[PDB]
Design a protein around this nucleic acid. Structure first.
Lengths: 147, 592, 118, 209, 78
RNA sequence: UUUGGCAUAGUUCC
DNA sequence: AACAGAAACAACGGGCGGAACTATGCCGGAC
DNA sequence: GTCCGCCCGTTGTTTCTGTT
């Protein structure tokens, strides 16, 4: 169809303990970043890369609706293991998941958002590099990727 | 050395990197050995379950447990597999002149007669006229058999499998009766002709006297009778073998005995025999061959792993590379992305003052002699791909007009300038998002040329006697010709067959479902047999044709393709107890 | 089946967007008949939609000017009228007619540059 | 293009002539063998705005055993043949007193039209053939052995000779390409004559069911 | 009118030999003069060679009919 | 002169 | 406008080698 | 002595055209 054909590729994230997929800009906004300039500072490190900017543009076109942390958290928490009958409990569940089950190795304290955002941006950046054919895809049989 | 070419022999020893590379090489062999076994066993089990109850009845027909005919004569001839031998026909390949000289029995020279036949027989031959008429009629029958053979066996293969080894029987007769080849014989060629005619009546496969039964017997013994007449020709007997009366009588007796012994015994379990005979090679077994190919052919899927479609050309396209490349272009799918160089969306409301300076002259010429939207869709076409496919910008423009109608505008440059330019303008619903959908559709849906679903098409001269065209010259020999043959990826058989300058007779694919839906059930049977023969004989192995024919008939007996799975096994109108023992027990029993 | 579905979805999308760009009264451009001095063959023919007599007369002048320039280089009306009429007869739509005329003009100019009579 | 359209019409006509010749109807040698230029001359070399307009190409021919039993070969001019078109064709057949007719379709027929074709089966027999299915003769392909339609007398004699009930023969679907080519109904038996590698010839039998 | 083959198939030969050997081993009269033999299988083979085995084979055609062939009438191939 | 079963692991042979 | 025939996509379920030989742990828990 | 990892045949859902 026409709209999918024009959009092309979109970037989505599968957070644990959540019913289905979430667009990445929603998660970044839920972390507390509103401005597209700031989100692109977290993702695209060198802004003199028009191909990367064009690749990330359709992901930002899903931010036409969501613009605030509260509504972003609501959207994330709507899809919990047991969806709530209220809204404050759903938003608290969303914050709890983004603070406890998303990237535990970065941190679990209250002020870990400033680093979780950077690491999630690094994941997205490496995905873009893979999609542009600038780094080789990993292989599971390589023994440096084993324990 | 870097990528693993071991320069040393096992006696000199391997340097450490070569040792590790050799271990990496041997691991693959160990893995294949440990992997193929279960799949081979499963294939053999499925075949056995499919054909476990097919038998040879006392009617001589081949029927399953429900008395449904599979073959009216086992192996289409009625003989047993373990009693037949390889033999040569010896009258198919020789030219006209050689054939006549070798099989004519000249009775006019009379010096060859005095040298080969006895004195009391040469006078009889030169005096009688009924003898001469019979001897000419024999050669007429041999010529007709030669034409029948050439129809049955194109590509000129003499090697064949028949029950009685006539040449070895003749050698045995010569040694048993102490025949001296340097002396004239006492065998009357009329006795030879009459003996062969009487012998052929005692080799009965289909018993009866109705026209239907006589036709069935003639069809059942045609090839062997042709071979018998070719071998026991009177001239060949007089020149080469030089038999005698008692020797010829003993030979006829031995032929009768061996033919009667080489007939299939009623009660044989030919279905299980065929299952084992086709499944035991599986344990030793750019396309797919071997175990995966056998799996695909047995359980037919509508999506083969590597579909292909070998295409033969009719005329001068077969020889000259020009029309060969032209057909190659005609039969390969190509959208606009395959030829486009770059594209862009501009904002240029001024027809005269154009943001791009290159189009100025011709865009002004177009606009000077006549609303519209101010947006643009400027695309650039790669010259190399544009000129490779022999495409033309007028052709692209008319294809765009056909695809979108006159609600678009199109202005195009020509190949004179170094930059080939196409400019498109439109003659909720905002322009930029509409132009991006126009570009996206026009680049992935245009279909400028080719046949859809045909991805890549190759073009190479054949190097095998089955993929080459073999004709018969005016002197009767077989001459092999090399003509260009195509080999595509992806299958759409009907369109390729309907294409101009494509041979509608020899064109074939390797998708069984496609062959079915295009050509029927008999064609699917023949094609399935050919594919099975190819996969089996890729390894140089040999399997008797009767087992192949039985498997193909079992699979295509009921008019539709019957995959050997639970679906096909339970589709049969058999008893529930046969189906319960195969891939579905409780469900079948409870349904019944 | 997916290609057929996508082609139908595209055609519906395209038709919707073009209907939103079609005004209520598409003024059918009135066909003005040729004048008494019109040198065009089949001048009154309405076979090509939206192709006017004045457009064909303009296209004919371009062919004459090109052929005149060619003859001046190599040391004409009848030939221009035949070239126009052949192009008219082969064309189905006005845009392709115009493009085939401009191609003939470019071919005449190429012959003139090469010092060849067209 | 006009050349390609003329070529397609000529190929369809030639295949239908071969089909009628195989079905036993009376088609002459000159009608069977027409060159492209001869067809261009006889019925227009220009299809678009020309004499051949998918009409006047309809063929009426009489069976070799009965001039009273005749067949039509109609060429609808519509990419999607409809109920009213089928009714028009049936009216023409009724007025000309014709039992059987062929219909070559540009692209396809609506399911409503197909069911309205099936409904009148005892009254009239009409068959649908696509434009793509007739650009080639499937019978001429080397993978397809010769088929012969057997009379009820031949069927009875065969069944008596082998002592077979018709359930015990191999089958062939009524939607088979060759079955549609020969126009065979359920209950008829076809005979397959093919060369063999181990016998030299082998005659099989198939029941249309 | 008998249409079945005039030879004795391997299966018929095997079953006839087994049944005749069992009959002899169950203390039944023989139809040949044994020249010193004692094994029932050997005696049965001797009888089959002599064409003295008193069995008639009932061959069932697939159409339900049948034909009775005596061992004396069937050509013994092997 | 009387008879346990379920699961997991390792090994032999094609 | 109501009805009906045919088709694209999605979800669900069954299917996956043959033999053979040793050993070891376990067969319900509280009151 | 009582309670506690991949393929592909079916069927559904939904959709898209034709008739009257």
């Amino acid at each position: 169809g026409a709209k999918k054909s024009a959009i092309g590729q979109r970037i989505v994230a599968t957070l644990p303990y959540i019913k289905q997929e979430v667009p990445i800009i929603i998660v970044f906004r839920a972390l507390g970043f509103v401005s597209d300039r700031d989100i692109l500072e977290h993702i695209i490190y060198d802004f003199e890369d028009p191909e990367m900017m064009e690749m990330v543009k359709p992901s930002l076109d899903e931010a036409f609706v969501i613009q605030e942390q509260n509504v972003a958290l609501n959207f994330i928490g709507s899809r919990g293991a047991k969806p709530g009958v209220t809204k404050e409990k759903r938003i608290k569940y969303a914050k709890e998941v983004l603070q406890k089950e998303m990237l535990p190795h970065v941190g679990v304290s209250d002020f870990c958002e400033t680093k979780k955002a950077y690491f999630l941006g690094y994941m997205v950046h490496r995905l873009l590099l893979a999609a542009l054919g600038r780094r080789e895809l990993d292989d599971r049989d390589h023994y440096g990727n084993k324990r | 050395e870097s990528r693993g070419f071991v320069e040393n022999s096992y006696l000199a020893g391997l340097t450490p990197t070569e040792f590790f590379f050799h271990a990496m090489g041997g691991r693959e062999g160990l893995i294949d050995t440990a992997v193929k076994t279960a799949e081979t066993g499963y294939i053999q089990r499925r075949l056995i379950k499919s054909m476990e109850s097919v038998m040879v009845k006392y009617d001589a027909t081949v029927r399953n447990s429900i008395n449904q005919v599979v073959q009216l004569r086992y192996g289409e001839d009625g003989l047993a597999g373990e009693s037949v031998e390889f033999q040569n026909l010896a009258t198919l390949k020789p030219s006209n002149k050689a054939f006549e000289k070798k099989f004519r029995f000249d009775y006019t020279n009379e010096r060859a007669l005095r040298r080969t036949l006895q004195e009391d027989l040469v006078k009889d031959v030169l005096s009688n006229a009924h003898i001469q008429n019979e001897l000419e009629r024999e050669f007429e029958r041999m010529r007709e058999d030669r034409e029948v053979l050439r129809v049955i066996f194109p590509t000129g293969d003499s090697k064949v499998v028949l029950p009685c080894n006539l040449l070895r029987m003749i050698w045995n007769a010569q040694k048993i009766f102490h025949i001296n080849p340097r002396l004239p014989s006492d065998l009357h060629p009329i006795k030879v002709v009459e003996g062969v005619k009487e012998l052929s009546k005692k080799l009965v496969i289909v018993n009866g006297d109705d026209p239907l039964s006589r036709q069935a017997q003639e069809n059942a013994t045609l090839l062997f009778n042709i071979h018998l007449r070719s071998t026991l020709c009177s001239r060949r007997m007089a020149e080469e073998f030089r038999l005698s009366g008692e020797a010829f009588d003993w030979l006829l007796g031995e032929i009768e005995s061996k033919f009667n012994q080489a007939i299939a015994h009623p009660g044989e379990m030919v279905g299980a025999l065929a299952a084992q005979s086709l499944g035991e090679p599986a344990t030793q077994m750019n396309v797919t061959l071997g175990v995966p190919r056998l799996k695909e052919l047995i359980n037919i899927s509508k999506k083969p792993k590597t579909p292909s479609l070998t295409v033969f050309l009719l005329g001068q396209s077969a020889r000259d590379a020009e029309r060969a490349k032209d057909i190659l272009c005609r039969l390969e799918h190509t959208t606009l992305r395959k030829v486009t160089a770059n594209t862009a969306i501009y904002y240029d409301p001024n027809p005269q003052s154009t943001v791009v300076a290159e189009d100025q002259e011709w865009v002004n010429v177009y606009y000077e002699m006549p609303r519209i939207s101010p947006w643009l869709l400027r695309v650039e076409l790669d010259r190399k791909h544009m000129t490779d496919r022999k495409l033309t910008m007028e052709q692209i423009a008319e294809k765009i007009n056909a695809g979108f109608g006159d609600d678009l505008n199109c202005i195009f440059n020509d190949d004179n300038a170094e930059k080939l330019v196409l400019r498109i303008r439109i003659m909720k619903m905002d322009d930029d998002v509409f132009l991006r959908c126009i570009e996206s559709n026009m680049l992935t849906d245009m279909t400028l040329q080719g046949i859809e679903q045909i991805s890549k098409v190759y073009m190479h001269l054949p190097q095998t006697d089955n993929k080459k065209k073999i004709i018969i010259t005016e002197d009767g020999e077989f001459k092999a010709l090399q003509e260009w043959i195509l080999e595509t990826d992806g299958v759409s058989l009907m369109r390729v067959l309907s294409e101009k300058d494509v041979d509608p007779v020899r064109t074939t694919s390797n998708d069984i479902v496609e062959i079915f839906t295009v050509l029927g059930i008999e064609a699917v049977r023949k094609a399935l047999e050919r594919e099975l023969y190819h996969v089996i004989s890729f390894d140089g192995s040999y399997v008797n044709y009767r087992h192949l024919a039985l498997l193909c008939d079992t699979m295509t007996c009921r008019g539709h393709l019957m995959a050997i799975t639970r679906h096909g096994v339970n589709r049969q109108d058999t008893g529930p107890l046969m189906k319960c023992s195969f891939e579905e027990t409780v469900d079948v029993l409870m349904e019944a | 089946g997916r290609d057929e579905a996508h082609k139908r979805e595209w055609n519906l999308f395209y038709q919707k967007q073009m209907q939103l760009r079609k005004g209520k009264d598409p003024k059918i451009e009135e066909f003005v008949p040729p004048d008494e001095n019109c040198p065009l063959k089949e001048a009154s023919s309405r076979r090509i939609p939206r192709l006017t007599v004045k457009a064909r007369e303009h296209c004919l002048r371009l062919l004459e000017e090109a052929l005149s320039s060619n003859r001046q280089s190599t040391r004409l009306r009848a030939k221009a009228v035949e070239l126009e009429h052949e192009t008219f007869r082969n064309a189905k739509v006005a845009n392709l007619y115009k493009a085939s005329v401009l191609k003939k003009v470019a071919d005449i100019h190429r012959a003139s540059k090469d010092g060849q009579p067209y | 293009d006009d050349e390609e359209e003329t070529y397609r019409l000529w190929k369809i006509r030639k295949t239908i002539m071969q089909l009628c010749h195989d079905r036993g109807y009376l088609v002459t040698q000159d009608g069977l063998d027409q060159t492209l230029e001869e067809f261009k001359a006889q019925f227009g070399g220009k299809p678009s705005e020309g004499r051949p307009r998918r009409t006047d190409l309809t063929v009426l021919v009489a069976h070799n055993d009965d001039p009273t039993d005749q067949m039509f070969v109609f060429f609808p001019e519509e990419p999607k043949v409809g109920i009213k078109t089928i009714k028009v064709y049936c009216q023409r057949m009724q007025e000309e007193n014709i039992t059987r007719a062929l219909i070559v379709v540009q692209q396809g027929m609506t399911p409503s039209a197909k069911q309205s074709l099936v409904d009148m089966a005892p009254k009239y027999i009409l068959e649908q053939f696509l434009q793509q299915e007739l650009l080639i003769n499937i019978t001429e392909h080397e993978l397809v052995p010769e088929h012969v339609v057997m009379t009820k007398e031949e069927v009875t004699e065969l069944l008596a000779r082998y002592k077979l009930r018709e359930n015990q023969l191999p089958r062939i679907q009524a939607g088979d390409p060759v079955a549609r080519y020969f126009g065979i109904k359920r209950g008829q038996v076809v005979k397959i004559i093919r060369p063999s590698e181990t016998a030299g010839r082998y005659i099989t039998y198939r029941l249309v069911q | 009118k008998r249409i079945t083959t005039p030879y004795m198939t391997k299966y018929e030969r095997a079953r006839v030999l087994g049944t005749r050997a069992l009959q002899i081993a169950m203390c039944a009269p023989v139809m040949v003069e044994l020249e010193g033999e004692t094994d029932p299988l050997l005696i049965a083979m001797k009888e089959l060679k002599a064409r003295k085995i008193p069995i008639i084979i009932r061959r069932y055609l697939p159409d339900g009919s049948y034909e009775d062939w005596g061992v004396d009438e069937l050509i013994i191939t092997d």
